[model samples]
Target: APARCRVCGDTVDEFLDLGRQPLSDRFLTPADTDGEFFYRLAVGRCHACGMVQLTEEVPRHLMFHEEYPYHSSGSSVMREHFAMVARDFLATELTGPDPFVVEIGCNDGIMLRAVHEAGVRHLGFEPSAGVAEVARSRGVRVRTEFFEKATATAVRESEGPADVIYAANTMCHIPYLESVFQGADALLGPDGVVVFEDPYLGDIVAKTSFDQIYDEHFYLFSAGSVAAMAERFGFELVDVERLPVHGGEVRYTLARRGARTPTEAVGRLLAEEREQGLDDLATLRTFAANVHTVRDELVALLTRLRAEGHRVVGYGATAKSATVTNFCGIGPDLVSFVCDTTPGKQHRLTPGKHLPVRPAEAFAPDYALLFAWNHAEEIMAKEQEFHQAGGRWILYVPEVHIR
Candidate 1:
């Protein structure tokens, strides 16, 4: 059987397998007392379209459900970032038009609330039961369903097309890009734009961020690949911007075809991707080998830490924590517990590793490893109590170091 690419919708000629992994957010559940939680996480690349994708197909419902633990407002830095983005969108795009904004996968209505407060009408399409409940409480209208052609049509029938459709961080989780792009076309107004923020594969490779490769994320996008995907669905890529959040991410803006001209920045980014060998199949082969090297090095270091009787706990019960924990085989033996600021994740066990997660304030004793190192500055500043309590902070990547 031929495997199809998630991003480009092309058949894969070859693949690189990462084997089975536990559901990124299943984090320890009591129902798994018999130890029966895991899933396949094989990845591949489409030579024809230059898109890197996962071969495994975990249902979106299985990953983002009532048990979804990631909350954007959990981190102070993220909350401030979303607030700024909302303010900017209103000032730049919402003026001179009665802008109707729609957000896909708007978890907990964090971003929508900011937009609503700015006096812009907004709607949120969220699938997670837990997150939907929170969004509703914030006085934001939320529909608890996955965004696709059907949902888009239903929304358009009632509310008409949206002026601005935004999706942050959730764009890469989609397994079927064709449906998403088709739905965007149906729901987007003629002069409107669809903006998405996702992890940039080029930045990930340059920064050696192998930890970003997980099952939840179906595609690792490049500017060239995204532009190609958008063009196939009657959209024009207008602009791309880099953000430091989540290691290194890119925010892509797309407009209805013939609605606006493609910016020169788009062409420049595509050219840069070409120069970076992102369009070459050989780069992905090298990437897979580099991924293995990082995994092995981290595991070896953790094994030594365990042998020396240094009690280690992970900070941030993030979805990517599953990849790091499982890849290193550092279960409860090496990592005693995971601490997180998100109330959604605390009091739950990490999906497959079964390491108990506690509040960030609960981190005590010995060495605390920062799982979400991308937000190291924010976590370090917020958890000043941890330092005052005489706890050492451990960071992995760009070489392991104790702070």
Candidate 2:
């Protein structure tokens, strides 16, 4: 029997098998390497709802614990993106008297800082204590717990219903989609909106960005699937907007069934998905094929580069990189080290490959495999000197290429 879809209780067809992989963010010390956990990081597609998701679920507690090292504020681009998102909500959704906003997975208070400073009522629900503490330090009120139906009701009764409930790159991490919708319904005001942005399934298939499929990201949402899910929860997919951030993403807005008219963008994208055969078995198989091509090309490129006496280093120790690196069996032999700016990860080893993670200043290499390909613009701009010194970037997403 095949695994059932997380959203719709239909048999899921396994499309890509990434083999056993360690938790991407679980950076290990030399002593802790002996006991690290690993699971099959594979993805499947549902025939009923067209939702693409992980076939096997990793316990959420194991993935988002006290020592979770990912901070959204680490990237300047994301910091600005969150600020803009905050202001947009303030100018639009939060214009009512005593307007209130709630952010799920508001890591480091990047967006809520703006809401707090604007004198609006706000609360952040962040499960990871480390990042939540940082958010609190920045004067953002945070509830250090997972946002579920019971938590939502408690918050609603305590702080009052939210005018806007939003998540940025957070919603997809949750495996229980129905619970999220139930929670959102319980917490949202009559006219309140539930907005979230996640890596789009269309973009993943189009760009062959298989790195987006990892333990933490349980679902890769499509307009068609999201609409189906929203309808199931007595809500409507009111709007859809494509975002350039996070490789590629879609900002989806849901409202009560009759609260708002569906936007043209929503219908247009769904039609596009239909025409592209996004839910078709053939499309998924092609995506899997594209994934293998990139894997083989990347491994061969790194191997040949090392054979030619050229040093290859990983540009970022991102969680997405863990999927690509571990699945393709890229170890310290192919890449000497990975350079990252996050202090928590800098001196530790990558999840599975055990490649030493050094400070970003240690990235002077012949070629750097860009694991953070989504942040290419920001990284390339900051590392102009590297390019001047003849350092090139080896990118795997959208095809394996060197620049």
Candidate 3:
């Protein structure tokens, strides 16, 4: 079935399907096996707007709820990254007298904690109850509500306009662009900027990271599509910053019409995306082929390792792993178990194949399949003992390799 583009209302041609996939972060208990949900996980491109998005959108409640297990402060590298982002905003946009800031999907107040500690006026819109409480415990102000036009308008009316509205790894998950843009327009001051960052489309294609196409990540944005989408919403893309966190990401800063000058980085990146043929159908098809090859090679390696009496365990019980494990039909028999640092995900089962998730402290294997390659540096730094013992790490990015 064909789907219309969420941004441009154009036809979206399907390219890749990960088959019926479960909610990526929905780790289940043993007794809950019979109660499960699945959706057709597919990717597509809108040729008219050069936007890449999921062919079908998943219901928000099912993915993000009271029991949402993802904690933003789990990764040490990400903790420093968010802290740095907060420091940058404080030194730049928040220098004005009585400046106020807002964050959308501010999970556990990772960024806003610094803002609060600086005695700056701030509020975090976090829908999940459990994590919101944690943020509150850290003395960060949080509202357990989704950010949209109505909520934004209410905040603007009561608390005045925000000087800087920031979101990290949150904007791309939302499919309703119009409402979000409308909210930004209503809540932001004339000079304010709505800054958000998510996994970049350029990196996904360059690395052939098909796992980034799961249900939650509804859109994989590029500079062109984002600029076009912004123009439609009476805003302009003013700045673009390439970030190394979360595999690869681009922080986009949007200003009200004619409010600010566009940065050179914006045009340069758009041109680069074009040169890479990011919008071309053939390029997408080639990416699909590359994904298939990676899946095949990964499965073959795991199978051979098991047959040869080599124990292999998964490194991170990440949401991205759901796509790989389900699409490649990987089960506990192949990976033995996945180690995760999050207490909520530990002692539970993976989304579809039910791979047992153990604590990171329990990780001990001859070979480790690194599902969380984004934090490879931090992980490698802490687990030097494994490397010293002649244990190899298995990775698949642009290609499958062992080190």
How accurate locally, in lDDT, is each candidate? 0.80, 0.90, 0.90
Model 1 lDDT per residue over 6-86, tens place? 666678755455665787766554655576557777667776776777777788877888867777776677888889889
- Looking at candidate 2, the ten consecutive residues that score lowest on lDDT are 68-77
Question: How many collisions per candidate?
Answer: 6, 0, 0
Q: Write the per-residue lDDT of candidate 3 for residues 69-116, one digit (tens) a residue.
A: 789997677889889999999999999889999999999989999998
Please provide the root mean square deviation of candidate 2 (C-alpha atoms, Å): 1.7
For candidate 3, list the clashing residue pairs, or say none: none
Candidate 2 vs. true structure, TM-score: 0.95
The residue-level lDDT of candidate 1 at 339 comes to 81
Candidate 2, position 364, lDDT: 60
Please give, for residues 62-111, the per-residue lDDT of candidate 2 as tens digits.
98889877788877878899999999998899998799999999989999
Maximum-lDDT candidate: 2
Please rank every candidate by TM-score, starting with the best.
Answer: 2, 3, 1
Per-residue lDDT of 160 in model 2: 90
Residue-level error in angstroms, candidate 2, position 105: 0.9
